[PDB]
Every structure is written in structure tokens, then in C-alpha cells.
Amino acid sequence: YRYTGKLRPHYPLMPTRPVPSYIQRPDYADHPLGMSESEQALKGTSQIKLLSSEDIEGMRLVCRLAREVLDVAAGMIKPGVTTEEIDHAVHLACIARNCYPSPLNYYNFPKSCCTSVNEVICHGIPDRRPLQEGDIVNVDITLYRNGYHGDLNETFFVGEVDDGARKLVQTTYECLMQAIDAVKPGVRYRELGNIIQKHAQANGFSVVRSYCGHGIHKLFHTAPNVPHYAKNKAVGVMKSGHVFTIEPMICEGGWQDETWPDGWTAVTRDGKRSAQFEHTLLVTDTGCEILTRRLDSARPHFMS
Ligand SMILES: Cc1nc(-c2ccccn2)nc(NCCNc2cccc(C(F)(F)F)n2)c1Cl
Ligand SMILES: [Co+2]
Numbered sequence: 096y097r098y099t100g101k102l103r104p105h106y107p108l109m110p111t112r113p114v115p116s117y118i119q120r121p122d123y124a125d126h127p128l129g130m131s132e133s134e135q136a137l138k139g140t141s142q143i144k145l146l147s148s149e150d151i152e153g154m155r156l157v158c159r160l161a162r163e164v165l166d167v168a169a170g171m172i173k174p175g176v177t178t179e180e181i182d183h184a185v186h187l188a189c190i191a192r193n194c195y196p197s198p199l200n201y202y203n204f205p206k207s208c209c210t211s212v213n214e215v216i217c218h219g220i221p222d223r224r225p226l227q228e229g230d231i232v233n234v235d236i237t238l239y240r241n242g243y244h245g246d247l248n249e250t251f252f253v254g255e256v257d258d259g260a261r262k263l264v265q266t267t268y269e270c271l272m273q274a275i276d277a278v279k280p281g282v283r284y285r286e287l288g289n290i291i292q293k294h295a296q297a298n299g300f301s302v303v304r305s306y307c308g309h310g311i312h313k314l315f316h317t318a319p320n321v322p323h324y325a326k327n328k329a330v331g332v333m334k335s336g337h338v339f340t341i342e343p344m345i346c347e348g349g350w351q352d353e354t355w356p357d358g359w360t361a362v363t364r365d366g367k368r369s370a371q372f373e374h375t376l377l378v379t380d381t382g383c384e385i386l387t388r389r390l391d392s393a394r395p396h397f398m399s
């Protein structure tokens with residue numbers, strides 16, 4: 096395999112981390128290939144769940160706990176710390192909140208969160224590589240509690256970063272916030288990509304096409320599929336009680352992605368940097384509730 100940039104996987108991984116049996120598990124946790132039968136049963140359907148009162152409270156809880164875990168990860172971002180170390184802390188933090196780390200064994204994904212450095216777009220596998228000053232790194236967290244998944248991610252600076260990294264990260268966050276600002280009953284899902292691409296393009300950046308936002312609730316990924324790029328053909332209209340993510344991945348160079356031999360790590364084909372931010376959203380009568388909002392600060396970690 097010809098790698099697209101400087102990053103390489105750093106093996107072996109530590110033995111898979113166990114989740115105590117008292118923590119409730121999603122269907123795929125114990126499937127040999129990590130397949131989710133509940134998800135497969137709805138594969139290719141475009142109908143969107145309207146959450147019940149009980150569902151909304153369940154989503155509120157797991158989304159709050161997921162934010163807590165992302166904040167744990169944020170505190171560990173420094174030169175020399177390996178992404179494996181971040182994942183261990185994350186794994187323990189999920190357990191401490193009586194949650195299952197949703198990525199663990201999801202379609203055999205080996206770790207409990209995704210750590211995406213520099214040219215990795217998404218789905219980076221936590222490994223023995225120490226973070227380097229100048230790096231940017233996304234940590235993507237999803238927790239499962241009482242039948243519900245909650246999903247967020249932020250990109251972080253490792254020590255001092257160059258002006259381009261600052262611009263990419265700032266712009267990506269601005270893309271996310273502009274899209275969220277447009278969310279309310281009656282807006283088409285396909286509209287969000289128009290807003291996101293307009294802003295990214297205005298700042299000399301491109302928009303990943305192969306990976307999208309998604310419905311989430313009792314399933315990790317379900318309808319709607321939410322592309323982040325302009326003139327896309329996403330199906331559906333926002334309604335009060337819909338829950339979904341917006342998680343735009345934006346790139347310094349071209350939009351094209353490819354996957355490492357590990358079957359997971361998505362990287363820019365040109366080896367230039369990519370950044371991502373993600374929230375889980377609940378559509379309300381007036382707009383939307385950001386379920387994964389940071390509670391003790393108005394701003395994401397990179398600003399702070
Ligand atoms: C957005 C997304 N994320 C993850 C994932 C998987 C492991 C850890 C974190 N995230 N898995 C996903 N899909 C799991 C089912 N298999 C598929 C199907 C189509 C496309 C993909 C892929 F690889 F994400 F593009 N995976 C998706 Cl759609
Ligand atoms: Co994912």
C-alpha cells in the first residue's frame with residue numbers, strides 16, 4: 096500500500112479492552128463480525144423515526160454522558176500522548192458512566208473511539224503513535240446507554256500549530272455551526288450541504304463526499320443520510336422530533352478519500368490535512384436542541 100502522507104499505523108495494538116458484563120450492550124457487541132441486525136433490518140429505508148418523550152429523555156442522557164467523555168479526551172491532548180492512551184481513558188470513562196463505547200466491535204472496529212490525526216479524515220484507529228507538536232487530532236465519541244446512542248466529535252490542537260491548521264479547524268467548526276443554525280422543521284436535509292460547502296469553498300477548502308451525517312437513536316447509524324457537500328440528493332424533510340448528526344469533514348487540499356489496508360482509516364488521497372466537528376441534534380418546533388453541547392463553556396476546546 097502506498098501511504099498518502101507522513102502518518103503510518105503504529106502496531107501492535109494492546110489486546111481488546113473488555114467491557115464489564117453489567118453494562119448493557121448493543122446487538123452488534125457480541126456478533127462475530129460486529130454486524131447490527133437492527134440496523135440491517137432498516138438498511139436502505141429512508142423513513143425517519145419520530146422520537147417519543149421517553150426516547151428524547153434517553154437521547155438527552157446519553158448525549159450528555161458522551162459530551163463528558165469527549166471532555167475527558169480533550170484534557171489529554173498534549174505532545175507525547177499516544178492515541179491508544181486517549182482511547183484507554185475514553186474506554187474507562189464510558190464504563191464509569193455505565194455506558195458501552197459504541198465504536199467497540201461495531202463492524203469489528205477494534206477500539207472504543209476514533210482518533211484521526213492530520214490527513215486522516217475519520218475512523219482513525221487509536222494506536223501506539225505519540226502525538227506530535229503541530230498535529231491536529233479529532234476524537235469521535237459515541238456512547239450507548241439504555242438502548243440509545245449519542246455521538247459527537249471535536250478536532251484539537253497538539254501544542255502550537257501553524258496558521259493553516261488554525262484556519263482549517265476554525266473554518267470546519269464554522270461550517271458545523273452555520274449548518275446547525277439552519278436546522279428547523281420544514282428544511283430539507285439536502286440543504287445543509289449547500290451551506291457547508293459554500294463556507295468551506297469560500298475559505299479555500301474542500302468537502303469530503305464519502306462520509307455523511309446520520310440519523311441516530313436506538314441505532315448508531317440510520318436514516319437520514321446527511322451529506323455535507325452542495326447539490327446532494329439527500330432524502331427527507333426535517334420535522335420536530337427527528338434526531339440526527341451533522342459532522343462535516345473539510346480538507347486543506349482535494350476532497351478525495353481512500354481507506355488504509357486496516358479497512359477503517361480514511362485518509363485524504365493527497366495527504367493534506369482534514370478536520371471535523373460533530374453534534375447530535377434534536378429538531379424542535381423552534382429549531383433544534385444541541386444534545387451534545389458543552390455545558391461548562393460556550394466554545395469548543397480548540398478555542399479555549
Ligand atoms: C458514519 C459511519 N461510521 C461508522 C463507524 C464505524 C466504526 C467506528 C466509528 N464509526 N460506521 C458506519 N457504517 C457501519 C456499517 N458499514 C458501512 C456501510 C457503508 C459505509 C461505511 C463507511 F465505511 F463508514 F463508509 N460503513 C458509518 Cl455509516
Ligand atoms: Co463513524
Ligand SMILES: [Co+2]
Nearest residue numbers: 235246247248
Ligand atoms: Co461520530
Ligand SMILES: [Co+2]
Nearest residue numbers: 246340342373
Ligand atoms: Co456521527
Ligand SMILES: [K+]
Nearest residue numbers: 211213215369
Ligand atoms: K484529521
